[PDB]
Design a protein around this ligand. Structure first.
Ligand SMILES: [Mg+2]
Ligand SMILES: [Mg+2]
Lengths: 257, 257
């Protein structure tokens, strides 16, 4: 029944915790004397990077500190400058984050043995993907296909990218495919596309923790942050939720019944 | 609640009875000394023309007959040569087969007034569609969008052409879309695409009759023939069947329940 799986990249296939973008946002602001925190930076983490910047700009705590520094509120120009800067720096450090999350690689190898097709979608622009893809391929990960918002009329949560995938992998109907992500948007897109939607937790952009703080965090404390997200997923369309990609082939078996 | 209807072209919105291709398919095989029937000729109607030729040669009755006549089964060269002929003959008559089918236009206008998007797919190439759609426009018919097999990995039954219509019209999930066609391939395309499928009988390729033959036919014999096409459509995936496009609107309403 299930013939292909569509994987997200950031916080799913690579970049444990999806920090690359978070790292950048904090720089462009810190360099301007208006330092923001990982929470409020990740706060918007789901919309157009361009608008993501503007959102941070209108965040009262940030908006006030900006006005304190520049003696004036951000200008549509500032947003446009910070955005240009955001990209340049991102292209710079993207490769340092294109490492396949330890769990994943093996899982992909297993699915491929079951003749199951591997596809993907993303929030990253084609420019950025060329970079992340190239590094991830040297590091052992390379899905059968890949699509970016540049390939379609609009990105997530539209199912456009997912249809492009099915079109290229040659799989139909939509319910013969699973969508695996690490964010609310990943869930929406999955459903909008009429396919089985699942959500990874450990290393998600939702759980927002690094491999470091996960391995060295209070069990009871961590076992609690995991629920705030696993629940968070189901509350958005996740037919299922998994702490790690190690539970993938298991959910498949379930689904196929 | 439905939001868009994807119409096939020949035998659905134009060319009553889908006659344009018919004599061309029979002619190309007749020149090789291998006669075929209208039934055989019409069986794979709806598919990308090149595929349609390949489909005819695949036919046991025809293949055997070909093998018996030439002492070897049909070749790729043969298929390719006949196709070249098929295109020459077709192109010189295509303008004469773009007249909208009678009451279709009134239906479209109604659909638009209800704010419903109009998309379409076909078996004709983009070059063929250029001629057909141009003439169709002049005669009052022009959907919001058009997609040929040239625009995707493959033609019918694959749901690729429908997904592009979804992308363009900005409609999701596929279940919010209805597919209307006049052949078996039309039915399969819709189901594969995960959308409400409807087949139209009078004027369809499956019925294979002219307007004359329809109005001047033994009503008892007519209803009887209607029953075979209908049973056929359903047999092949059709969710509902209608005699004419006038019934469409009603079917939509039933579905919205
Ligand atoms: Mg992600
Ligand atoms: Mg047709």
């Amino acid at each position: 029944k299930i013939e292909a799986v569509i994987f997200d990249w950031a916080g799913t296939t690579v970049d444990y915790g999806c920090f690359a973008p978070l790292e950048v946002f904090m720089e462009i602001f810190h360099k301007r004397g208006v330092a923001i925190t990982a929470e409020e930076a990740r706060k918007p983490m789901g919309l157009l990077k361009i608008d993501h910047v503007r959102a941070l700009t209108e965040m009262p705590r940030i908006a006030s500190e900006w006005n304190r520094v520049f003696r004036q509120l951000p200008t549509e120009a500032d947003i446009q400058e910070m955005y240009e800067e955001f990209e340049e720096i991102l292209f710079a450090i993207l490769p340092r984050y294109a490492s396949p999350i330890n769990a994943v690689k093996e899982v992909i190898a297993s699915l491929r043995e079951r003749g199951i097709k591997i596809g993907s979608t993303t929030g990253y622009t084609r420019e950025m993907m060329d970079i992340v893809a190239k590094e991830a391929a040297l590091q052992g990960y390379k899905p059968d296909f890949l699509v970016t918002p540049d390939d379609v009329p609009a990105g997530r949560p539209y199912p456009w990218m997912c249809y492009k995938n099915a079109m290229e992998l040659g799989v139909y109907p939509m319910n013969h495919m699973i969508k695996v992500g690490d964010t609310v948007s990943d869930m929406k897109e999955g459903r909008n596309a009429g396919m089985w939607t699942v959500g990874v937790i450990l290393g998600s952009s939702e759980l927002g923790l690094t491999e470091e703080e996960v391995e060295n965090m209070d069990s009871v404390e961590l076992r609690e942050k995991i629920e705030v997200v696993r629940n968070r997923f189901v509350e958005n369309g996740a037919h299922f939720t998994i702490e790690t990609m190690q539970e993938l082939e298991s959910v498949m078996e379930h689904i196929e019944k």
